[PDB]
């Protein structure tokens, strides 16, 4: 009766879905009772403080458990033959072989081998002792408490901001380019130059001597003079032992390319020059805008003047500032699109260009980080389109958007959905056709009749980047071109000696299996956008339901009439796209994991012969590498992979349980729950015990969300157990 304090209509619900929807539309602030736009913005501001405080508390917990139950100081001495430690295990349910099986890494109690990569990230930014990590945990715990105080105090009425303060898009986009991105990257270069560079050279720079230890031996005179090349005179040698001064080097802002020869990682000197350069460019781009000083540029004038005539984009970008600034789901959709793309960018560029010392030797760390940020990017990219669909129902106004790009998008929505349908249908037809063709050829003992289309277009890009394996000799693999010649002192030879190494992940050599699986990835991307764009554009209406905007974003159906309207809502079209999203990210991580397993084992031909046909994916990757996984426990005993043997089944159990909410739908279950209500209300001495919420079955939208949640959790837990065990068992 009380628990949805935000929803007085849910508070009058005598059933048990009062609890389930009090938990589920609690953060849909716009649908709360008595909500105004000012209280909306105030609750969102406090919510962002809560998210920041949780992120800092989480990082401080990582730091504290590494400093306390980990072997970071032991890992610094030997980062190749020592496994990292996440946290100790206190499980009273263990037996003695389980206690003795999880003791490794040089510890005494049972421990977990961390695959989050945090030792490689902390060791390259200057952490060497546990006392450097306790200070970080205490600092981030203090900053998390400060953000909890801030989220409490900016809700207090002397400190509650106005409605007009949140709609200052001009000042926010000024300050979050100049200050939050440029000054922060300049300060991170200040951390790299002052702390990470001398600690990589073996000189301790802590909080006691950073005002007394020069980063450069003639420091701040070449910056004020003009000869900035003095900051790049002596880099680290090719015999540099990391963390010591054996062939150290003295430069702070070098520009080399390629990798450190020991750590197989990016040099910290040109990572410093990287963050310094993009700090300068972010400061220049952040003094572009006109807030309160007369000079700059205005968001109200640039938008409604970029309109091309003669029916090119219609009325162009006329009327967007009334709808970008007023809508939060449009801003959240653009923000999620940007974050989900640059998260895929983080994932693609942290395996090929590993930024951290002794990363890409720890293979399980690399697989976990890639698969982690790729699923994070897949969920964030499907939520970009989800909030883009919430925009068209809740926020879109056609009379405010007369003729702009956002109305022309809805005007030819059928052309968009039909062309995405064509591209997805073409890609699936021919990708499945060539895979089934190669399977039929492998079955009949004739591998030569396979369609093995060579990836010509991407081998040309590798050869234009300097990979001399294919002989296209176009720009950087040609020794006579101008793009080759005008960078031989600047950044090229380390990059050319790093590509042509066939043992890093920097531009792997590719063949017909990589053709087929990049077209599988294109199938997945175009089909996921087919489902998401079709859900965003038909969110307001269709010929089956011309008033879909009248029912809102999430609703079950419109009944059995008009042929039947199961899954008609835009929520239910996000819903079906999460399956194709998990499919797509599963394809990219199957492909990443198996090409890297065959790379790390040595036999890239074992991939190149088997990845051309789906039986080779089934038995040379799934069947083959899940041996030591499933042998985590057996009647002979158990080992340290048994926790991944359990979770691999645990993920198989949640996944199938999702199908119970997916295949069986509500109304079978309400009829079962009514017989259970009968049995409880007619049982002797159980009549005394009576509920407060009337038991009903889960609603239709709720059944979708619960089945999708179990599907995704079982999907992620199965592949995480398989990935970690399959990599860290043989390595």
């Amino acid at each position: 009766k009380l628990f949805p304090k935000f929803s007085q209509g849910l508070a009058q619900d005598p059933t048990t879905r009062r609890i389930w929807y009090g938990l589920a539309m609690a953060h849909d602030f716009e649908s709360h009772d008595g909500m105004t736009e000012e209280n909306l913005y105030q609750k969102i501001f406090a919510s962002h403080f809560g998210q920041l405080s949780i992120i800092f508390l989480w990082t401080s917990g990582n730091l504290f458990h590494v400093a306390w139950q980990g072997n970071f100081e032991q890992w610094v001495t030997d980062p190749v033959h020592i496994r990292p430690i996440a946290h100790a295990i206190w499980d009273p349910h263990f037996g003695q072989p389980a206690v003795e099986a999880f003791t490794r890494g040089g510890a005494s109690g049972p421990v977990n081998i961390s695959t989050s990569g945090v030792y490689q990230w902390w060791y390259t930014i200057g952490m060497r002792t546990n006392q450097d990590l306790y200070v970080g945990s205490v600092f981030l715990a203090l900053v998390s408490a400060i953000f909890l105080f801030a989220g409490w105090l900016h809700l207090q009425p002397n400190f509650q901001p106005s409605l007009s303060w949140f709609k200052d898009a001009e000042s926010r986009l000024n300050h979050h380019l100049s200050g939050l991105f440029g000054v922060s990257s300049l300060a991170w270069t200040g951390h790299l130059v002052h702390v990470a560079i001398p600690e990589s050279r073996g000189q301790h720079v802590g909080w006691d001597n950073f005002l007394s230890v020069l980063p450069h031996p003639q420091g701040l005179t070449p910056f004020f003079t003009g000869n900035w090349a003095a900051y790049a005179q002596s880099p680290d040698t090719a015999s540099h032992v990391f963390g010591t001064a054996q062939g150290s080097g003295q430069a702070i802002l070098t520009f080399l390319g390629g990798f450190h020869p020991q750590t197989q990682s990016l040099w910290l000197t040109d990572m410093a020059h990287h963050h310094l350069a993009i700090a300068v460019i972010f400061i220049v781009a952040g003094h572009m805008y006109r807030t309160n000083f007369g000079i700059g540029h205005r968001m109200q004038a640039i938008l409604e003047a970029h309109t091309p005539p003669s029916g090119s984009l219609g009325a162009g970008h006329k009327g967007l500032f009334d709808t970008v600034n007023n809508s939060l789901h449009f801003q959240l959709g653009l923000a999620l699109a940007s974050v989900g793309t640059i998260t895929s960018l983080v994932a693609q560029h942290m395996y090929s260009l590993p930024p951290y010392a002794f990363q890409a030797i720890d293979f399980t760390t690399q697989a976990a980080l890639y698969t982690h940020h790729q699923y994070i990017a897949g969920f964030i990219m499907c939520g970009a389109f989800a909030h883009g669909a919430i925009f068209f129902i809740r926020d879109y106004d056609p009379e405010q958007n007369k003729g702009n790009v956002l109305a022309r998008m809805l005007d030819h929505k059928e052309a968009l959905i039909s062309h995405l349908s064509w591209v997805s249908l073409f890609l699936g037809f021919h990708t499945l056709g060539l895979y089934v063709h190669n399977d039929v050829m492998q079955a009949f003992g004739t591998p030569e009749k396979q369609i093995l289309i060579e990836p010509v277009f991407a081998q040309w890009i590798q050869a234009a980047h300097g990979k001399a394996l294919y002989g296209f000799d176009f720009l950087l693999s040609s020794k006579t071109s101008a793009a080759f010649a005008n960078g031989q002192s600047l950044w090229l030879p380390g990059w050319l000696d790093a590509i042509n190494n066939n043992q890093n992940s920097l531009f792997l050599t590719i063949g017909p299996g990589d053709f087929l699986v990049h077209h599988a990835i294109a199938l997945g991307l175009h089909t996921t956008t087919l489902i998401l764009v079709k859900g965003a554009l038909d969110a307001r209406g269709s010929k089956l339901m011309p008033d879909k905007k009248d029912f809102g974003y999430s609703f079950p159906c419109d009944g059995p009439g008009r042929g039947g309207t199961c899954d008609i809502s835009a929520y239910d079209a996000f819903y079906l796209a999460v399956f194709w999203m998990l499919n797509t990210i599963g394809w990219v991580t199957f492909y990443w994991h198996w090409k890297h397993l065959t790379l790390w084992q040595g036999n890239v031909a074992q991939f190149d012969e088997s990845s051309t046909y789906l039986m080779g994916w089934l038995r040379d990757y799934l069947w083959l590498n899940s041996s030591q996984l499933i042998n985590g426990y057996n009647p002979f005993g158990m080992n340290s992979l048994s926790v991944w043997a359990w979770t691999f089944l645990f993920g198989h159990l949640i996944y199938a349980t999702g199908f119970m909410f997916l295949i069986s739908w509500r109304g079978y279950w309400q009829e079962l729950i009514e017989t259970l209500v009968w049995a409880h209300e007619k049982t002797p001495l159980a009549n005394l015990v009576y509920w407060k919420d009337k038991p009903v079955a889960l609603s239709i939208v709720q059944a979708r969300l619960v089945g999708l949640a179990h599907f995704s959790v079982g999907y992620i837990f199965t592949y995480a157990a398989f990935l970690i065990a399959s990599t860290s068992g043989r390595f």
Binding site: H93, A98, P635, M638, W646, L672, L676, W678, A679
Partner: protein
């Protein structure tokens, strides 16, 4: 039709009971084998669940040519007990022992 609620409610109960006390035995064995505790499992070398009733029926159907079917020269099959018929070097039929895993799969 006038006590379908009683029928479906008691069958709901016996399905939930059979689900816990059949599949939770497998989850228990998974957990004990994963927690390094193979003695606490449900097996023949552990907590035993012997199918006493089916084993008794196997004994009576193997001893049926003795006194309950006196004109049978052998038992009606070889699964009840005895020797094995071997044809061409391969086993045609041999006796079938029923143990703890047989109990768990029959439930």
């Amino acid at each position: 039709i006038r006590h379908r609620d009683a029928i479906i409610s008691h069958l709901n109960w016996v399905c939930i009971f059979l689900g816990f006390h059949s599949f939770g035995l497998y989850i228990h064995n998974d957990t004990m084998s994963a927690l390094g505790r193979p003695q606490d499992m449900f097996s023949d070398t552990a907590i035993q669940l012997q199918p006493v009733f089916a084993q008794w029926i196997q004994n009576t159907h193997f001893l049926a040519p003795q006194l309950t079917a006196p004109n049978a020269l052998a038992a009606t099959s070889l699964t009840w007990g005895g020797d094995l018929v071997a044809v061409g070097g391969k086993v045609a039929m041999m006796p079938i022992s029923l143990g703890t895993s047989d109990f768990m799969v029959h439930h």
